[PDB]
Amino acid sequence: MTMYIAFILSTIFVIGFVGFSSKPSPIYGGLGLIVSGGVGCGIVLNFGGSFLGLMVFLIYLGGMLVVFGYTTAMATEMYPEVWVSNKTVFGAFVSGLMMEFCMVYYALKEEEVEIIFKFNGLGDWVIYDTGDSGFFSEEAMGIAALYSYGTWLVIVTGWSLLIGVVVIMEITRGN
Amino acid sequence: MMSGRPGRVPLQFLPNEARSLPPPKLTDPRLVYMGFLGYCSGLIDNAIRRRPVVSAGLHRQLLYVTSFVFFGYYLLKRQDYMYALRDHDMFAYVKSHPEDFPEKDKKTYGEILEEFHPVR
Amino acid sequence: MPLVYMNIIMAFAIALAGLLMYRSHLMSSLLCLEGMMLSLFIMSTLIILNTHFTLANMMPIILLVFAACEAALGLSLLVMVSNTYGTDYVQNLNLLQC
Amino acid sequence: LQYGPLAFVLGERTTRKLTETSKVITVDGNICSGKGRLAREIAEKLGLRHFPEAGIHYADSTTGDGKPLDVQLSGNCSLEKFYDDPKSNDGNSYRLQSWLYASRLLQYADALEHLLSTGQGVVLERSIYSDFVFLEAMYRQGFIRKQCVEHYNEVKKVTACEYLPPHVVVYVDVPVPEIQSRIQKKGNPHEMKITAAYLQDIENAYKKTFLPEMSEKCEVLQYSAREAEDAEKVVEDIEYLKCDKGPWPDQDDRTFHRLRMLVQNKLEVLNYTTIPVYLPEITIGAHQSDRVFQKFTELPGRKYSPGYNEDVGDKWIWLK
Amino acid sequence: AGRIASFLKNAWAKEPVLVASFAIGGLAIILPSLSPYTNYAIRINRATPYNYPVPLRDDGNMPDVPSHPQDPQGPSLEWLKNL
Amino acid sequence: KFYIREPPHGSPDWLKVGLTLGTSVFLWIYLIKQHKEDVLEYKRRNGLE
Amino acid sequence: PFFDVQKRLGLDLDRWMTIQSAEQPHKIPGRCHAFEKEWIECAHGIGGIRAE
Amino acid sequence: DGPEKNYEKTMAILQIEAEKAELRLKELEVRRLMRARGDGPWYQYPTIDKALIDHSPKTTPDN
Amino acid sequence: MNPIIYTTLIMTVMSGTMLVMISSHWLLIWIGFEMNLLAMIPVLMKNFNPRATEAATKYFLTQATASMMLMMAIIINLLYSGQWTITKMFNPVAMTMMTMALAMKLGLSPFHFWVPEVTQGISLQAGLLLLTWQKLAPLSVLCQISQSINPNLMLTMAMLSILIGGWGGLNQTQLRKIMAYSSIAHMGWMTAVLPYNTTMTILNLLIYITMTLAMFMLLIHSSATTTLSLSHTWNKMPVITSLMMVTLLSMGGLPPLSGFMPKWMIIQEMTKNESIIMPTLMAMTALLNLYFYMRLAYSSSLTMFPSTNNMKMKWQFEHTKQMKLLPTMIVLSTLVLPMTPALSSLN
Numbered sequence A: 001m002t003m004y005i006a007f008i009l010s011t012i013f014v015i016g017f018v019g020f021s022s023k024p025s026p027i028y029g030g031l032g033l034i035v036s037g038g039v040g041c042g043i044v045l046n047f048g049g050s051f052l053g054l055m056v057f058l059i060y061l062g063g064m065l066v067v068f069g070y071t072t073a074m075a076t077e078m079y080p081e082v083w084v085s086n087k088t089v090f091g092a093f094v095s096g097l098m099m100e101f102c103m104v105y106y107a108l109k110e111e112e113v114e115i116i117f118k119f120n121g122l123g124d125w126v127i128y129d130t131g132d133s134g135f136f137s138e139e140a141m142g143i144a145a146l147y148s149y150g151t152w153l154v155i156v157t158g159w160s161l162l163i164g165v166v167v168i169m170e171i172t173r174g175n
Numbered sequence B: 001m002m003s004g005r006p007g008r009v010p011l012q013f014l015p016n017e018a019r020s021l022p023p024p025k026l027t028d029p030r031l032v033y034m035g036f037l038g039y040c041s042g043l044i045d046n047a048i049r050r051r052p053v054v055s056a057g058l059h060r061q062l063l064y065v066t067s068f069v070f071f072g073y074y075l076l077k078r079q080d081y082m083y084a085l086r087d088h089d090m091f092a093y094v095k096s097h098p099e100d101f102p103e104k105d106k107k108t109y110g111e112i113l114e115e116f117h118p119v120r
Numbered sequence C: 001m002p003l004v005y006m007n008i009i010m011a012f013a014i015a016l017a018g019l020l021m022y023r024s025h026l027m028s029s030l031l032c033l034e035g036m037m038l039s040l041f042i043m044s045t046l047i048i049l050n051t052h053f054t055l056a057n058m059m060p061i062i063l064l065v066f067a068a069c070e071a072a073l074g075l076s077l078l079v080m081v082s083n084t085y086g087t088d089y090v091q092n093l094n095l096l097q098c
Numbered sequence D: 001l002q003y004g005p006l007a008f009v010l011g012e013r014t015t016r017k018l019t020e021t022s023k024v025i026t027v028d029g030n031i032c033s034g035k036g037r038l039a040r041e042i043a044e045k046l047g048l049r050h051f052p053e054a055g056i057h058y059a060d061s062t063t064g065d066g067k068p069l070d071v072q073l074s075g076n077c078s079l080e081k082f083y084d085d086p087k088s089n090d091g092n093s094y095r096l097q098s099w100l101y102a103s104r105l106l107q108y109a110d111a112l113e114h115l116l117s118t119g120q121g122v123v124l125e126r127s128i129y130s131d132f133v134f135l136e137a138m139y140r141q142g143f144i145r146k147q148c149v150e151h152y153n154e155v156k157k158v159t160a161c162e163y164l165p166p167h168v169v170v171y172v173d174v175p176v177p178e179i180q181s182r183i184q185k186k187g188n189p190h191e192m193k194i195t196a197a198y199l200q201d202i203e204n205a206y207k208k209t210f211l212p213e214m215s216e217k218c219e220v221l222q223y224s225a226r227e228a229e230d231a232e233k234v235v236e237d238i239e240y241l242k243c244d245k246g247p248w249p250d251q252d253d254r255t256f257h258r259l260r261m262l263v264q265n266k267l268e269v270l271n272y273t274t275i276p277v278y279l280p281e282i283t284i285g286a287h288q289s290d291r292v293f294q295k296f297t298e299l300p301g302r303k304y305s306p307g308y309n310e311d312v313g314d315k316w317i318w319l320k
Numbered sequence E: 001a002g003r004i005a006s007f008l009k010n011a012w013a014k015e016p017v018l019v020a021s022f023a024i025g026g027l028a029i030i031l032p033s034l035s036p037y038t039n040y041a042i043r044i045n046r047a048t049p050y051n052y053p054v055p056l057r058d059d060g061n062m063p064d065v066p067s068h069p070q071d072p073q074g075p076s077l078e079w080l081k082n083l
Numbered sequence F: 001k002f003y004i005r006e007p008p009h010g011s012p013d014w015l016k017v018g019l020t021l022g023t024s025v026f027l028w029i030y031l032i033k034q035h036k037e038d039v040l041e042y043k044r045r046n047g048l049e
Numbered sequence G: 001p002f003f004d005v006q007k008r009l010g011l012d013l014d015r016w017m018t019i020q021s022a023e024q025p026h027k028i029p030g031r032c033h034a035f036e037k038e039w040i041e042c043a044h045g046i047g048g049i050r051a052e
Numbered sequence H: 001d002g003p004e005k006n007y008e009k010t011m012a013i014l015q016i017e018a019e020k021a022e023l024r025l026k027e028l029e030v031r032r033l034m035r036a037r038g039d040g041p042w043y044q045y046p047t048i049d050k051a052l053i054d055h056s057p058k059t060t061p062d063n
Numbered sequence I: 001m002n003p004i005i006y007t008t009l010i011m012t013v014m015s016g017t018m019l020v021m022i023s024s025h026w027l028l029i030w031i032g033f034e035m036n037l038l039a040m041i042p043v044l045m046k047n048f049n050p051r052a053t054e055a056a057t058k059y060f061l062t063q064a065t066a067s068m069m070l071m072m073a074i075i076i077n078l079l080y081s082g083q084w085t086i087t088k089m090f091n092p093v094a095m096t097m098m099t100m101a102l103a104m105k106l107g108l109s110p111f112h113f114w115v116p117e118v119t120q121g122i123s124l125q126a127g128l129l130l131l132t133w134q135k136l137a138p139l140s141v142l143c144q145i146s147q148s149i150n151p152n153l154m155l156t157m158a159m160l161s162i163l164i165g166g167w168g169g170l171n172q173t174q175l176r177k178i179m180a181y182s183s184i185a186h187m188g189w190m191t192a193v194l195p196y197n198t199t200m201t202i203l204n205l206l207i208y209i210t211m212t213l214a215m216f217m218l219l220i221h222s223s224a225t226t227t228l229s230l231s232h233t234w235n236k237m238p239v240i241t242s243l244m245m246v247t248l249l250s251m252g253g254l255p256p257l258s259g260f261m262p263k264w265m266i267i268q269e270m271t272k273n274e275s276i277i278m279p280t281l282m283a284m285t286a287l288l289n290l291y292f293y294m295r296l297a298y299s300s301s302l303t304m305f306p307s308t309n310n311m312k313m314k315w316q317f318e319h320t321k322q323m324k325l326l327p328t329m330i331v332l333s334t335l336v337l338p339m340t341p342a343l344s345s346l347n
């Protein structure tokens, strides 16, 4: 739907999110969230976070899960899981479709969905503003300020990563 | 409670106006207790290390007593400061809200009834 | 509160349930453990981009970055479990019974 | 200071000190099979610090004057008692072995500390890995019981795991009729009372289990007593080898810091030797333990920590 | 002297990439301190007008601010025009 | 001497102990000093003495 | 915070991006800069209790 | 010693504690009244300072 | 592991915990939390035994879940406020969502399940860090946002902690486990007064640290892990178990032994806030803590237990560990009660 395109983007984000959170095989679970990872990028891309959308592809989508799928390769269960192997995973999946299709329909209704928070599930296109960005890109300028305004943020991130590499080797060598 | 008062520069163990109070005397009973605790640390240290506790080195115990006496005196000033601060701003407040604390009139016990309850 | 925000909010809620409601294989939780921060990362970008909080574009990257060290910490502990029991199955993850 | 973190930080390694003459030699054999003399011969030929065979008062000959203490005050067991009475009720049999195993274990720690602080090899008789052959043999004829074995090997696994196996083992092969005829030549009245059954059990336990169980940890240098006499023969092929087996020819300064942490802490090497397993032959009730410990207290030197005894003559107590 | 020159000699003899890599980072960190052009770089990086040069209320007592882009007073960047 | 080996504390470690008195004498002299002007300052801050 | 070390030393550690009306790269305004400025100026040295 | 010693010393003892007793009750009720309102020195929970806002003109005319 | 990295791995744990209390930004609050977690795991894995790996997995899974849950306490806060400043929470849903996040990092309500198991798996030295230093950081955040905290939600977490913490210790024989359960019970005490007056929470934290330090190095000096192993310690070192008895009673809270000071102040503070049922049940169930407390004292020094022949070996050798700050910790944790009015210093 053109008007609510991000809503379709958002809905696809959760159905894949439910699928892999339903504890399927790690390879299958990888598929469930990478499509969720890709579709979530479109949501950020549609809002204007060009770098943030493209960057989650490179370190999370093409990053995180490649070494993650690497780990499931050496796990190599003799009985790899398929969605039909257990009925619990199907029960979660048909559930994940159930309440999702439930309250989006209730969202399609008078629009007073009030689970936990108060939500007005109107068309997502309304929330934007009418202010131009001139020449500077708002997202690009913000991240570029890491080296001018992010003085403490960069130091702890750099320090922790150096701690990160030493701790990884310290706990994998096995004394 | 304190934390957040006006003029409360943080990480300060003794603000400047705290010095306008009578400093504790070196023979303060609270202070001599600090010295007593330090001495008891010296006995434990020798007992822990299996040494003749009573006179197992007069250097280790001397540092124990002096260090506790030192840290006590500075703690005492901050102790004395905050309690003085706690009562001080109260008096400013008690004169800042006269209507909240009205003086109840005084009537001697020649008027107030106490419905004496006999005991049997 | 706009629908897109609701969709991500529930996305974590199932992820929180998915990690908490556990299964035999410990891998799947680790996917869901960092999956839950992906929704955190995704929605975080949404508010900052919506609100034109230029400086707060700091958070979306660094939020994921330390979430990576945790995932990096995650499977690194996992291989030790696999090197001691054979599978990361969590029903055998009970050596500390006593 | 010792290998305590500061010394390791300032660059003090241990592989720097290690040389080709850095090995653990277990010159074992049979009961009085002449291995004691061979221990000295090997030690003096390649310049290794020799350790006399661990006994009951070995730990007594480590602290203070390095002199034997009262048997009641140290050990409470008597090998002569076991030699005279085979199956008594006082429990000298098992208690002798467990105290022996601890004394050998302390000897192992002293050996490693010397090697890890000098880089020079060490030779030991009847290493703590051997010890189990005696105890199981004592069980064969009934000196100890089934429930006795459970305490000993429980101490064995919790203690001997971290200590690295030796590099060289010399099994001086002496056959049973020779030993059963030589024990008359010794003449010490306690060791005449040795049963051929107890002897027969110790050798077969040795060849069948002592050599093979740690063969994969270091090579087996079998040497007949005839080979033991010719010390010139045994000194060639100890050098003719590398001892790639076991984990010793893999360790680095990373593990050596851990190893010298434990051996330096003499209390730590044997902290696990006192496992709260309440075996009747070693469990000492409070009343006897209190009185004995009180007897240990007012002994010279032992009253305070070392260097803090005014009775011995340690001046400057009021300052040190 | 002897050890340092010999250490560099075998380092380039056996680990030429390591010497090249360590050298390149060696320069890359120090010349900017002594670089005279970096002061030009910051000036041009600031002389790039992104937002509008918003006006100011001309009520007198500010003579330096020009009343026109083609006025003499004000920041002239002809140095960059020649840089 | 009873002990076969010199124990790590079985000797007066002159440098260490001399530091310990050095710590204390500096500590007390600071303490008696600090109480002096702190009292003196309090005397004049409120106008007492 | 618990120990406001930044206030004592004066060094800006995290105050730069703590709110959306602070200094911004190339003076990019937030969506609610006017409201945040009005609110933040209303509650200065007033205390969280009564400023609510 | 004389009963005057005990009489006047108790006389001072009772005055000291009564002054203490009055302040203890006064401190409790002020603290309650102070926490609810907060228009005074203590119990002032932190708020963001004015200094950290940007008064310089932005790119968008209004802001 | 190698001491130099072992030094800096622990050293960052202070740095991460330091950052939690010295940063006014919500992001940096999480920043120090997970730098702290990143360097905590290897210290757990220092021994490298299957139990040590077992303990690390439970701790990481618990701590990682809470911190990611902590972000969305921040995220909704940002979603409804636009403020990253560490002050009054503006969203009730985020506020509870935050409290469960921090409570799990502290382990008071049934989030506490990892506290005994994780403690037992790791070594005694690592147990010291886990129950003493990696507890200030969650309490640091709670102290700042205490005014806003939901009274019913926080107090409910507190009682369930001490109630379970009291009951759990009555059946554990391992010294580490009973140590952990008593730590849970104390943690309920501090967080109970937390909404009322944070100064008493800090005083409880400062006091509670003293015994937990003092008890741990005493056990490390004793090199004992189980009650029977503690029983033998009287023979070799009758003095050490004697001081352990004194500090053990101080942890129980019997006057004049300092340790009753926090409990005394908590009862008085809650009473001033008209809450009088809260302290009574809180104090009454503190007796549950005292039972297995005295039970340890019964087997430690009060009645000499049977020893073993090999213990004769240990008398000959002297201790090599340095146990720094032990004598001061014992003394400061048993007799500081007359210096109670030093509470104003913490204000």
Ligand SMILES: CCCCCCCCCCCCCCCCCC(=O)OC[C@H](COP(=O)(O)OCCN)OC(=O)CCCCCCCCCCCCCCCCC
Pocket: B043, B047, B051, B052, B053, B054, D303, I237, I238, I239, I240, I242, I245, I246, I256, I257, I301, I302
């Ligand atoms: C609040 C209520 C009370 C709370 C605390 C209660 C504590 C005791 C409770 C019971 C404890 C369990 C049961 C008994 C356990 C005994 C433990 C023990 O080790 O006992 C035997 C041991 C033998 O003594 P030893 O260790 O050799 O030391 C001798 C002195 N160097 O004995 C010892 O180790 C004890 C050594 C004690 C040394 C005391 C030295 C005192 C010195 C005082 C100097 C005073 C100077 C005064 C100056 C005045 C003018 C300024």
Ligand SMILES: Nc1nc2c(ncn2[C@@H]2O[C@H](COP(=O)(O)OP(=O)(O)OP(=O)(O)O)[C@@H](O)[C@H]2O)c(=O)[nH]1
Pocket: D029, D030, D031, D032, D033, D034, D035, D036, D037, D053, D079, D096, D097, D100, D125, D126, D130, D131, D132, D134, D135
């Ligand atoms: N129970 C027990 N006794 C042991 C052990 N190792 C050595 N012994 C005893 O140590 C004593 C001395 O060993 P012997 O072989 O008899 O004599 P020796 O003088 O050492 O002679 P060599 O063996 O030739 O060096 C004997 O009583 C042995 O039984 C052991 O592991 N257990």
